[PDB]
Amino acid sequence: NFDTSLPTSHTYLFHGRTLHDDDSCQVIPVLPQVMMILIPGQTLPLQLFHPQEVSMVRNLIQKDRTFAVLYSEAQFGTTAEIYAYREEQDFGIEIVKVKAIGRQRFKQAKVQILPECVLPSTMSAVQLESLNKCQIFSYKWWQKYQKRKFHCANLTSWPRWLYSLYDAETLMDRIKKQLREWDLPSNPIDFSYRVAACLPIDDVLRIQLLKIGSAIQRLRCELDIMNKCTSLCCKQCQETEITTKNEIFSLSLCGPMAAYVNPHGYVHETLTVYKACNLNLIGRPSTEHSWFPGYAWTVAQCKICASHIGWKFTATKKDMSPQKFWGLTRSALLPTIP
Amino acid sequence: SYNYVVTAQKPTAVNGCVTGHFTSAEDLNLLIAKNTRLEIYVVTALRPVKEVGMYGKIAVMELFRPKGESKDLLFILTAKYNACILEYKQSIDIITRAHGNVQDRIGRPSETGIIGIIDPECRMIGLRLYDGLFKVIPLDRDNKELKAFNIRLEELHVIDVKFLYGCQAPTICFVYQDPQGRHVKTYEVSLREKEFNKGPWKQENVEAEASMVIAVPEPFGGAIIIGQESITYHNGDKYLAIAPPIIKQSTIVCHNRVDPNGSRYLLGDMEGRLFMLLLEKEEQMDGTVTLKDLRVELLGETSIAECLTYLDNGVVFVGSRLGDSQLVKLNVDSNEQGSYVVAMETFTNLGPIVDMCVVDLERQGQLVTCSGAFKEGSLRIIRNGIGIHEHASIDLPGIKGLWPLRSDPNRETDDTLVLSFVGQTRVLMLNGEEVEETELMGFVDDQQTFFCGNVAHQQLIQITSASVRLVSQEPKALVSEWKEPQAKNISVASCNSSQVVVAVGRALYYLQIHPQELRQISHTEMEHEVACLDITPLGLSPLCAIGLWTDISARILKLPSFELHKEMLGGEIIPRSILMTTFESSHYLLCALGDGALFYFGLNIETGLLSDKKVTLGTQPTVLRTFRSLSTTNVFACSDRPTVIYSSNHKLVFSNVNLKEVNYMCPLNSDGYPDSLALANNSTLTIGTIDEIQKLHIRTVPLYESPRKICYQEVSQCFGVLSSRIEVQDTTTALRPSASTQALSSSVSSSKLFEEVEVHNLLIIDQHTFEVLHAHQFLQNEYALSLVSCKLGKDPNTYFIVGTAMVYPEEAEPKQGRIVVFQYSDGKLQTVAEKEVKGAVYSMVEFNGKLLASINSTVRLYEWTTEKELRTECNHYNNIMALYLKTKGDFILVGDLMRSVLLLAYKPMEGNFEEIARDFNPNWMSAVEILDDDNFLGAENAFNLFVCQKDEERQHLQEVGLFHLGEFVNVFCHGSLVTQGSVLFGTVNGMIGLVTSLSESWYNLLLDMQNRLNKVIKSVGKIEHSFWRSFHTKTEPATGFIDGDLIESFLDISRPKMQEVVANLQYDDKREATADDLIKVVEELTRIH
Amino acid sequence: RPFVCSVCGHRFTTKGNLKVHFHRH
Ligand SMILES: Nc1cccc2c1C(=O)N([C@H]1CCC(=O)NC1=O)C2=O
Ligand SMILES: [Zn+2]
Ligand SMILES: [Zn+2]
């Protein structure tokens, strides 16, 4: 195949340890002209040109090295921490390139950290003391798990199989099988945020999971989308099918979707799929600043409305795997239940 | 909103048990802990001593004896990390020697929960609270604050941990698990260095499911490892391992050491089996012995064990949570029979109340609960009243009267019971407990008797419908007889020690009782035929109480003038009984009508003026009678629902008697039945003692399967109970005959739509006999979820409707279900209509003639058509799982296990639902209810209750009530056992409680009352009541609730503490309140349950 | 074709043609 670790290292373009404790009030910079909904753990590359910004970062290195990313204007956002930085002055154009990663959700910005709401198991309240000793333990293993972990359901008014539908470990596995389908973290908090950034949804649905504070409600709601959103259409003209779930595959290590900068600093969360229909290709395949080294990109736009949906990527070697794939920018898509 | 909670039944399940020497170094105690309660017994060949209630959930209960101390001390740790060390003092108090909160700021609670262990030398107390930390409490005599230091545990996932016997320093031995499997490790705990030192030994590849560590005492040393298959012993480099076959069927979950040498242990199964693990020793070539092998013998079956303890005389206490606790005796395997077990005593445990319902059965409504699980599953009927311990029964129907009689004039004790009938009279004699009907020489046995008994001048009397007879004690014979001059019939009679006022129709006559004569005195007419009389002295009576048939009034007549004070009753129905008696200090009069009313007035036995109050007591006529209880006589009111009438704080109180209908009664102090009562009803005479107070009475109906839901159907006089039994794969093979298999008539679903296994049935259980009348078994892999009784549409029949869910193991979220409408007529249950549904019917409640069923995330509203079917007229979809359904009129309360609640309303002009409000505060929620149109009650995680109020963007609910209950609530239902409204709730621990709404005038009073009682009352572990009741998970102080168990303890503190509380109080009717103001107020609150 | 859009990579020949396409963003 191809090096699945190449796209996440942003080759085409630091021990991070500053966290703010929950519910605090912090004053954090917000970068001009950045528009995206950023998720804890999601990776964000940037390219800044105005000396305003270039000053903010050069001095931002001192202390926090963390800025705020925000829109419906904006009620919530997420702190992003710079983990890598180069100051390039090539062609006589001073550019500052940074790679930040989302850390904390919050409600210069006066900003209140939103706590990640962590709850014990459904059983930690009703668990028999005698059975405490048994709480630590190819799919019958899950029937065993269900029978032994949720044994004390018999003390309550609902069955084992209900408490199972709110069990982080179980839910993560149910999500995993779909994530396996087109080939991750162990902490439910992390898992729910990793697949949140993988899920190709629209700005209004992304704010929903961001508003969700609990891992359990995040994983559950995330399972709904994965069943209910089989098709993906052109956002502009609405009624035009571009690709399906079947075609989604994770070319990048992080997932089928990550954030990528073009040379002018615009961020594109592009989704890698094998097949894509009803697109026209314009211009000539080019490797200049390609986010997938080895492939050339050609601009693809919706057959009907001409609105730029993403790019078709083609191999440059005749021995490469996934010789042709489509990369679709998330802002251009609309999930549909056919 | 301001509500009021109070424990209606203390918890019954046992958290843990431990014996020792606590009350005195010479006694042997058994200490039992039931959630927020602690029992102290003294072992005999079990004597209660002291029950105390802590302000915490008892999580760690261990005894220990420090060096140079008289008796053992008790260490207690609540679930809120309240540590305390207690001592017994003899009237009886339990003091706190050292206390403190051992909670840490940072740290994640461990997955195996709290574990508290004490070293054998009582140097230190070791507590496992969080992953990676081990908190040590030096037991120094000067450590009254329980100061403690933490140690780094690089072993994060610990299963169990105990202290090892026989070591040069305190040493732990714990089983933990890392990616490399399971292991066992030992650590030397340094009191000085405050760190860990490498222990005497550790092991690798400890068995796969090791869960229990036992510490063998000094004879051998080392520890024992209990697993799913193997039992293994370690000691230094010694190793023994057996995998006996007699344990492979289920898991050992509780153990207890029998003898101090560690030779014999007791192992408790999860399915209730009782084993004894035995060590076997071997003589060594230089002194002490050496362990050689381990044996296990199945002693038998007990209740599903949770804690185990061995009392000295071969008697085991079986502390259970799913079933009743036990005292079981074990017989050593003897030539005669293999070691077997037999239970001596049984202790009531309401178990894990899964569901319940309130029912008016005897027409005070009693509570019937689904209790227990598996073979301990059962039904519990809980009635409230004064219970009567029966001592003898006699089959005589139609008793019209009852009188005690002393045939021996030299014997104070009674020995005769006279029974009247229609045109008949029977005289019974009492020699011990043998009753025999005989004749009384001088008494006539062919007339109805209206009165008889002992009168003055060493004589008897009998007032039949025809004559007033006077019989002599010595040589019993008639001496004088009063008969109506025109041969008219005596209609109403009344007599006492000296006076006799009979009454023929309108007229009535006044007689006096003298030696060998009955002298008439007064001949008087009346306006209207007389109906009741009383002539009780307060030895002679200077006044006579009468009631008139057509007047409908109670009168007071001076004797012998018969000159009227008076009051009027009103109505179209005549009085049936009237009585003048004395309560507390002041006098009274009581008159009861045919419709069941009961007027009572304050009487002046000098001025005859009666004053004042009336109350109804059933709808059948009431007959009043006086009996003696303690040194204050009470009034027994026979009727449809009998009731004891006493006075506490100069107010008449009516506590009902736990009996079916009673018609006539009389006290009876015989040789064989001393200080007893003779109760008479429509069929049987009963003799027995009577309790002094009103207590909770629990009838047990064993089901031997797990009952899960229950509803009542009055038109059929039976209950519908959802239950599930467990069956093996076989090749229909149950484990034990249960209620679903021992039904009178059994049916099977057989529908058109669509290793252990769960088999669900609908049990039809008689309300009177609690027979299993019918048991309809549902489909294979069908899980019954919701059950309701109701009438639908214009259909007059009452149907059992059940909501199910096809549970296949491969489908994570269920995708299909049923709504089955049953009808129980004759002796059979018929399937009337199915309704296939693409989801789980989690909840169903009747909705104004329609059926409101929840289906996964959908709330459906079905209609009941003339074709006898379910037609759908409405639907509503939600972003949550409609788990909870409660309604009232047109509001609908919907909620999921995530505490997120929705409030819907049926808009009738649109055939559609509108979302009125919404509140999402993610937490684990177990039960909800609707208090009124504005407030909603619920129980969320960490044993809490919350209330959400309604009062445009006011579609968001305000959190007005928060309260740490200490109990896991499973069900809310409306009703009481006879402040506004009443909501009962069941508990996993068996606790039963009550919530009632209050007015703001009273809430602030009882709030300031509580702030005063906390300054006074001495808590057990000195746990601040604010911290015990503080909302816990976040942590907030309580609001909107009043601890009724606190308000009710005002009557237990001494009288100085009472004034002390009411020092600067402004009461309502605004004056410096007094203790008696609050006693009569707090006592009024004890009568709502 | 040295005039490129700042979002996708579409190339044009005149500065005015690029202004036509960018107005669609
Ligand atoms: N060189 C330019 C110039 C203008 C705009 C873009 C690029 C460019 O390379 N990409 C994307 C194309 C798609 C890709 O793989 N990497 C990119 O940087 C642009 O949007
Ligand atoms: Zn289009
Ligand atoms: Zn463009």
Q: Looking at beta carbons, which residues of chain A come within 8 Å of B921?
A: none
The number of angstroms, rounded, from the C-alpha of B627 to the middle of its chain's C-alpha atoms is 29
Taking alpha carbons only, the member of B909, B946, B944, B940 closest to residue B926 is: B940
> Taking CB atoms and an 8 Å cutoff, what residues of chain A touch C11?
283
Please answer yes or no on whether C10 and A307 come within 8 Å at the CB atom.
no
Do B705 and B723 touch, CB atoms closer than 8 A? yes
Please give the single-letter amino acid code of residue B843: S
Chains with 3 or more CB pairs under 8 A to chain C: A
Greatest Cα pair distance, chain C, in angstroms, is 20
A268 CA: nearest ligand 1 atom: 20
Q: What is the DSSP string of B485-541?
A: TT-PPP-B--B-SSEEEEEETTEEEEEEEETTEEEEEEEE--SS-EEEEE-------
Tell me, yes or no, whether A292 and A324 share the same domain. Answer: yes
* 8 Å CB contact between B464 and B490: yes
Sign of CA dihedral A101, A103, A104, A108: negative
Q: Collect all residues of chain C within an 8 Å Cβ-Cβ radius of residue A286.
A: 9
Task: Report d(CA B796, CA A126) in Å as an integer.
Answer: 42
Place of tokens 């508003």: A211
Q: How was this structure determined?
A: X-ray
Tokens of A299: 């601009």
**Can you tell me the distance from the alpha carbon of B997 to that of B1044, in angstroms, rounded to the nearest whole number?**
12
Distance, in Å, from the CA atom of A107 to the CA atom of A26, rounded to the nearest integer, reads: 11
Q: Is B766 exposed, middle or buried (0-12, 13-18, 19+ CB in 10 A)?
A: middle
Q: Which residue has the tokens 């799929």?
A: A273
CB contact under 8 A, B943 and A133: no
Residue spans of beta strands (DSSP E) within B433-493:
434-438, 449-455, 459-464, 468-472, 478-482
Separation in Å, CA B500 to CA B453, B539, B626: 12, 13, 18
Question: Could you give the angle at which helices A168-181 and A140-149 cross, rounded to 10 degrees?
Answer: 160
Whole-number Å distance between alpha carbons of A166 and A176: 16
Contact B185, B179 (CB under 8 A): no
Is A200 part of any domain?
yes
- The Cα angle at residue A319 between residues A314 and A324, in degrees rounded to 5: 25
Among C6, C9, C24, the residue with its CB nearest the CB of A299 is: C9
Please indicate, yes or no, whether residues A20 and A77 belong to a single structural domain of this protein.
Answer: yes
Order of strands across the sheet with B499-504? Answer: B499-504, B507-514, B517-524
Give yes or no: residues A19 and A4 share one domain: no
3-state secondary structure at position C16 = helix
Supply the Cα-derived Rg of chain A in whole angstroms: 22
Which of B510, B528, B507 minimizes the C-alpha distance to B518? B510
- Whether omega before B260 lies within 30 degrees of 0, making that bond cis, reads no
Residue B912 burial (CB < 10 Å; 0-12/13-18/19+)? middle
- Contact between C24 and A286 using a beta-carbon 8 Å cutoff: no
Q: Are residues A100 and A7 in the same domain?
A: no
Cβ-Cβ contacts under 8 Å, A135 against chain B: 111-113
CB atoms within 10 A of CB B1011: 12
Residue B238 contacts residue B224 (beta carbons within 8 Å): no
What is the number of alpha carbons within 13 Å of residue A127 lying toward its C-beta?
Answer: 26
Q: Are the C-beta atoms of B266 and B255 separated by less than 8 Å?
A: yes
- Chain C residue numbers touching A297 (CB-CB < 8 A): 9
Encoded tokens for A128: 């028999």
Q: In 3-state terms, what secondary structure has residue B785?
A: strand
Give all chains having 3 or more CB-to-CB distances under 8 Å with chain B: A
CA distance B262 to A276: 74
| CA B660 from centroid of its chain's CA atoms | 20
Task: Assess whether A316 and A263 both reside in one domain.
Answer: yes
A141 in any annotated domain: no
Report the DSSP pairing between strands B93-101 and B82-89. antiparallel
Q: Which of B789, B811, B888, B806 is nearest to B841 (CA)?
A: B806
Q: Domain count of chain C? A: 1
Rounded distance, CA B853 to CA A149, Å? Answer: 30
Give the binding-site residues of ligand 1, using a 6 Å CB cut-off. A 262-263, 288-292, 297, 311; C 4, 8-9
Domain range for residue C25?
1-25
Residue B924 has its nearest CB partner, among A125, A157, A217, at A125
CB atoms within 10 A of CB B230: 18
The rounded distance, in Å, linking the Cα atoms of B483 and B447 is: 14
Min Cα–Cα distance to chain A from B1001, Å? 36
Rg (CA), chain C: 8
The verdict on A120 touching C (C-beta cutoff 8 Å) is no
Residue with CA nearest ligand 1 atom 7: C9
Q: Which amino acid is at A184?
A: L
Helix (H, G, I), strand (E, B) or coil at B1001: helix
The token pair at B79 is: 């679930």
Say how far apart CA B688 and CA B393 lie, in whole Å: 9
Kindly identify which residue of chain A lies nearest to residue C8, measuring between CA atoms: A299
Answer yes or no: do B159 and A136 touch at CB < 8 A.
yes
DSSP string, B876-918: EE-SS---EEEEETTEEEEE-TTS-EEEEEEEGGGTEEEEEEE
Q: Are B709 and B726 in contact (CB under 8 A)?
A: no
Instruction: Report CA B1088 to chain centroid distance, whole Å.
Output: 15
Extended strands (E) in B648-751: 652-658, 664-668, 676-680, 684-690, 695-702, 706-713, 718-728, 733-734, 745-748
Query: In this structure, are A104 and A193 located in the same domain?
Result: no
Are B674 and B662 spatial neighbours (Cβ–Cβ below 8 Å)?
Answer: no
Residues B654 and B1003: their CA atoms lie apart, in Å, by 26
Query: Do residues A304 and A278 lie in contact, with contact meaning Cβ atoms separated by under 8 Å?
Result: yes
Instruction: Tell me the one-letter amino acid at B270.
Output: M
What token pair was written down for B240? Answer: 């023994």
The residue whose CA has the least distance to atom 17 of ligand 1 is A262
> HEC states along B162-207?
EECCCCCCCEEEEEEEECCEEEEEEEEECCCCCCEEEEEEEECCCC
What are the phi and psi torsion angles at C22 (to 5°)?
Answer: -65, -30
* Interchain pair A299, C7: CB under 8 A: no
Mutation pick from B881, B898, B925 vs chain A, by most beta carbons of A within 10 Å, is B898
CB-based contact (8 Å) between A282 and chain C?
Answer: yes
Instruction: State the CB neighbour count (10 A cutoff) for residue B763.
Output: 24
Are A221 and A261 in a shared domain? no
Closest C-alpha to ligand 1, atom 5: C9
Ligand 3 centroid from CA A267, angstroms: 13
How many whole angstroms separate alpha carbon B785 and alpha carbon B760? 10
Q: What is the token pair recorded at C10?
A: 């579409």
After what residue numbers is chain A broken, C–N > 2.5 angstroms?
13, 70, 72, 107, 137, 183
Give the mutation candidate from A308, A326, A329 for the C interface (greatest C CB count, under 10 A).
Answer: A308
- How do B115-118 and B124-128 pair as beta strands? antiparallel
Nearest residue in A to C24, CA atom: A307
The beta-carbon neighbor of A283 closest among C6, C7, C10 is C10
- Tell me which residue has tokens 């790679």: A99
The beta-carbon neighbor of B988 closest among A135, A136, A155 is A155
Cα distance from B968 to chain A (closest Cα, Å)?
Answer: 7
Q: Is any Cβ of chain A less than 8 angstroms from the Cβ of B352?
A: yes
**Cβ atoms of A136 and A80 closer than 8 Å:** no
Both A273 and A312 in a single domain? yes
Q: Tell me whether residues A282 and C6 touch, CB distance under 8 A.
A: no
| Rounded CA separation B455/B460 (Å) | 5
Asked if A266 and A320 sit in the same domain, the reply is: yes
CB atoms within 10 A of CB B306: 24
Report the domain count for chain A. 3
H or E segment to which residue A207 belongs = helix A203-211
Question: What residue owns the CA closest to ligand 1's atom 16?
Answer: A290
B950 residue type, one letter? K
Q: Tokens for A224?
A: 């709904």
Query: B602: how many CB neighbours lie within 10 A of its CB?
Result: 13
**Of B921, B949, B953, the residue nearest B937 (C-alpha):** B949
Interface contact A246, partner C, CB < 8 A:
no
| Residue A135 token pair | 């709480």
How many residues are present in chain B? 1089
Q: C6–A308: do the CB atoms touch at under 8 Å? A: no
DSSP secondary structure code for residue B323 in this structure = S
Q: Which domain holds residue A220?
A: 167-229
Within a domain: A130 = no
Among the listed residues B398, B261, B376, B393, the one whose alpha carbon sits nearest the alpha carbon of residue B321: B376
Amino acid at B41: Y
A248 with A326, same domain: the answer is: yes
Q: What's the reported resolution, in angstroms, to a tenth?
A: 3.6
**Assigned token pair, B130:** 């969080």
Whether residue A244 is found in the same domain as residue A181: no
Residues A7 and A28 in one domain: no
Mutation pick for ligand 1 pocket among A2, A6, A46, A262 (CB with most ligand atoms within 8 Å): A262
